[PDB]
């Protein structure tokens, strides 16, 4: 992560400026949204690794002692 | 079912590009909507087909014995 100033031309010019500033603010807000999205993706990756590790650890440690004891006796 | 500044020429080309972009989007949407129409037609046919089969199979399962019991 010539001078043709007229009440309808000025509206068009001002509205074109408004359109540009509108998509400027939209781009800024969108980028601020992708920042949080990147954050959520990073926690997704970290917790994927953590949860697979805990799944392996729970599949092992619950059954480890009684399996090695049966291997020995 | 004569004002040849680069900025002005770039603005002209950008407006043209905007129009061609929206045209291409409309052209893609038309064929997407054609496929949607085909799927909608298939759903209208299959609704009637499935309700008909729902009635017909139930009747075929049960009437063969219910009519025999009515005759008995």
């Amino acid at each position: 992560m010539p001078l043709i100033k007229h009440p309808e031309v000025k509206s068009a010019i001002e509205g074109i400026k408004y359109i540009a500033e509108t998509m400027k603010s939209d781009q800024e807000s969108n980028n601020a949204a992708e920042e949080w999205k990147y954050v959520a993706m990073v926690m997704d990756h970290i917790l994927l690794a953590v949860f697979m590790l805990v799944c392996i650890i729970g599949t092992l440690a619950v059954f480890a002692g009684r399996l090695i004891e049966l291997n020995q006796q | 079912m004569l004002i040849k500044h680069p900025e002005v020429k770039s603005a002209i080309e950008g407006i043209k590009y905007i129009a061609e972009t929206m045209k291409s989007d409309q052209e893609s949407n038309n064929a997407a909507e054609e496929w949607k129409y085909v799927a909608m037609v298939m759903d209208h046919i299959l609704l009637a087909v499935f309700m008909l089969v729902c009635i017909i199979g139930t009747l075929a399962v049960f009437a063969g014995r219910l009519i025999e019991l009515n005759q008995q």
Partner: peptide, 23 residues
Amino acid sequence: APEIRCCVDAVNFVASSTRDQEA
């Protein structure tokens, strides 16, 4: 003339935004 330059820059900006979204 400055008023024309400002709207020219605005039009260029809204063209570049569309090019960004198409990439």
